[PDB]
Amino acid sequence: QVQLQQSGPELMKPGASVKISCKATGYTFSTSWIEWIKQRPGHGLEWIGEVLPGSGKSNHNANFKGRATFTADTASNTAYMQLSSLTSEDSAVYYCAREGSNNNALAYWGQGTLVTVSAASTKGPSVFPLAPSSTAALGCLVKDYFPEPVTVSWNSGALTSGVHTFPAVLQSSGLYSLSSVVTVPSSSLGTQTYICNVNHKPSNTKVDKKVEPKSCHHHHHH
Amino acid sequence: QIVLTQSPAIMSASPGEKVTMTCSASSSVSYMHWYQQKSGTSPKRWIYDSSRLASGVPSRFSGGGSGTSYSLTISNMEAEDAATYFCQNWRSSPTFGAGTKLELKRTVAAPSVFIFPPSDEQLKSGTASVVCLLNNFYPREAKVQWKVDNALQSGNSQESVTEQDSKDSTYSLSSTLTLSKADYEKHKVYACEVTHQGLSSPVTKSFNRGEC
């Protein structure tokens, strides 16, 4: 099958330049153009440009005036995009896409790369539990992190029904916070183990947190 | 420039309902592509060359049009069709439409409310976080109020909401009240009060700082 694999998320200080990769497989790397598509909250999909790998040919979206330098490497099956000088207008998700078999439509899409442009420093998240009491509900609070994004899952992927991972919220502090919660029968909260897996690559953090019933020492039993 | 204009920017349909969005060019155009997007994932290409259904797309979908107006159409809306859909043509600039957020309307669901007191480990670091979950509800709008003892709280909480679930089509909301160790331990009762169309009577959830 056809696949495009993008580089991880990034933090760059304004006026520096990011170079982001797209690894193409399952097709003749030189038959198809590689298209680069931008997306900010609010502004939806805008086209940045394209490269036909190793024919020297590449097209700049007028808007960008030489800033979006589209290169490629035909025996690495990897196309690139460098963004020349950075403002926060660049803070977006960037995609690569390959056009169709016989048709000028973006038929295959990268997974996306979040670039954040800010002078602010990287911070890993503090992960705190959200402990059930009393269909019970539990989760984790992925607090005080920067930049976006973080991933969250449960039982290393094994648990997905009733999972709600919320949008991140920017805090007064200039740091982000989000919650992931899962609902589960409370007749399992004895020895059905629950762990939220929090990965935030910009700070190279990984946290595997057990959310436990904080059943205290004041009461009685169940 | 040829400018693509999409209508209606936001719309809602019940199951079985026939829906018809519209992408209009400020000039003439010979084809229209459509891509479907659900929050936080790559747009899937959906309908290409005006009418041709991309692999894997249900046949209840159909596209068409000509020259100055092209459209997207679902013969009978279904849960999994609720998404944002962008029209797109290469002679046009900007190249893409601004999209149409198609939502699925359905029978009302009252939110389950859960409250969470700050965790032990968090407290021993500086601040506090009391989280309130309004879970699995229809529609989006809900009122949440934080009641610390007597008082009501203003300018010290934040909200976040999921997109429409694919299964049931319900939302889910979370409120975080942030108040330091000091002011956390300077108080006793922590309440979360919830209003909703499905809620005939408000729902309150609470706990006392040192209690079980």
The CATH architecture that domain B2-106 belongs to is Sandwich (2.60)
Q: Do A178 and B96 touch (CB under 8 A)?
A: no
Q: Which two tokens stand for residue A94?
A: 């960037």
Query: Rounded distance, CA A32 to CA A11, Å?
Result: 30
List Cβ neighbours of B120 (8 Å cut-off, separation of 6 or more): A214
Give chain A positions within 8 Å (CB) of B86.
Answer: 44-45
Q: Do A45 and B88 touch (CB under 8 A)?
A: yes
Experimental technique for the deposited model: X-ray
Instruction: Please give the CATH number for the structural domain made up of B107-212.
Output: 2.60.40.10
Closest chain A CA to residue B211: A218
Residue with tokens 């997109």: B163
Which amino acid, A12? M
Question: Is the separation of the CB atoms in A178 and B174 below 8 Å?
Answer: no
Quick one: A120-222 is in which CATH superfamily?
Answer: Immunoglobulins (2.60.40.10)
Question: Is the separation of the CB atoms in A180 and A138 below 8 Å?
Answer: no
Question: Is the separation of the CB atoms in A164 and A140 below 8 Å?
Answer: no
In Å, what resolution does this model reach?
Answer: 2.8
Mutate to test the interface with A, among B113, B114, B169 (most CBs of A within 10 A): B114
**Residue ranges per structural domain of chain B:** 2-106, 107-212
Task: Count Cβ atoms below 10 Å from residue A67 Cβ, excluding itself.
Answer: 16
Cα dist. A68→A47, A58, A78 in Å?
A: 11, 10, 16
Question: Is the separation of the CB atoms in A50 and A36 below 8 Å?
Answer: yes
Q: Which two tokens stand for residue A103?
A: 């048709």
Instruction: Please give the CATH number for the structural domain made up of A2-119.
Output: 2.60.40.10
Residue with tokens 């169709």: A100
List Cβ neighbours of A157 (8 Å cut-off, separation of 6 or more): A197
Tell me if the bond preceding A185 is cis, omega within 30° of 0.
no
Query: Rounded distance, CA B206 to CA B187, Å?
Result: 13
Query: Rounded distance, CA B25 to CA B1, Å?
Result: 10
> B1-15 b/e with 16+ CB inside 10 Å = b?
eeebebeeeeebbee
Query: Rounded distance, CA A138 to CA B93, Å?
Result: 47
Query: Rounded distance, CA A165 to CA B69, Å?
Result: 39
List Cβ neighbours of B125 (8 Å cut-off, separation of 6 or more): A126
DSSP reduced 3-state for B123: helix
List Cβ neighbours of A40 (8 Å cut-off, separation of 6 or more): A89, A91, A92, A93
Phi and psi at residue B165, in whole multiples of 5°? -55, 145
Do the strands B44-48 and A163-165 form a parallel or antiparallel pair, or are they unpaired? unpaired
Question: Is the separation of the CB atoms in A15 and A27 below 8 Å?
Answer: no
Q: Please check whether the two domains, B2-106 and B107-212, share a CATH topology.
A: yes
Instruction: Name the minimum distance, in Å, from the CA of A58 to any CA of chain B.
Output: 16
Q: Which two tokens stand for residue B113?
A: 């409310």
Interface residues of A toward B, Cβ cutoff 8 Å, are 44-47, 95, 100, 103-112, 126, 128-131, 135, 137, 139, 141, 143, 164-169, 171, 177-179, 181, 183, 214, 216, 218-219
Query: Rounded distance, CA B131 to CA B150, Å?
Result: 19
Question: Is the separation of the CB atoms in B98 and B6 below 8 Å?
Answer: yes
End-to-end Cα spacing for chain A: 52
Residues of chain A with CATH 2.60.40.10: 2-119, 120-222
Cα dist. A101→A33, B48, B157 in Å?
A: 11, 12, 50
Q: Do B116 and A183 touch (CB under 8 A)?
A: no
Q: Which two tokens stand for residue B152?
A: 């009501």
Question: Is the separation of the CB atoms in A107 and B93 below 8 Å?
Answer: no
Q: How many residues appear in chain B?
A: 212
Q: Do B88 and A103 touch (CB under 8 A)?
A: no
Phi and psi at residue B184, in whole multiples of 5°? -75, -50
Give chain B positions within 8 Å (CB) of A111.
Answer: 42
List Cβ neighbours of A163 (8 Å cut-off, separation of 6 or more): A153, A154, A180, A181, A182
Strand residues in chain A grouped as ranges (E): 3-6, 10-12, 18-25, 34-40, 44-51, 58-60, 68-73, 78-83, 92-99, 106-109, 113-117, 126-130, 136-145, 151-154, 163-165, 169-170, 176-184, 195-200, 205-210
Laid out side by side, the sheet with B61-74 consists of B4-7, B19-29, B61-74
Query: Rounded distance, CA B85 to CA B21, Å?
Result: 9
Q: Which two tokens stand for residue B49?
A: 């060359």
The secondary structure of B6-43 as a DSSP string is: EE-SEEEE-TT--EEEEEEEEEEES--EEEEE-TTS-P
Of B45, B135, B160, the CB nearest to A105: B45
> A78-113 b/e with 16+ CB inside 10 Å = b?
bbbbebeebeeebbbbbbbbbbbeeeebbbbbbebb
Closest CA to B61 of B50, A76, B69: B50
User: In 3-state terms, chain B is what percent helix, strand and coil (to 5)?
Assistant: 5, 50, 45
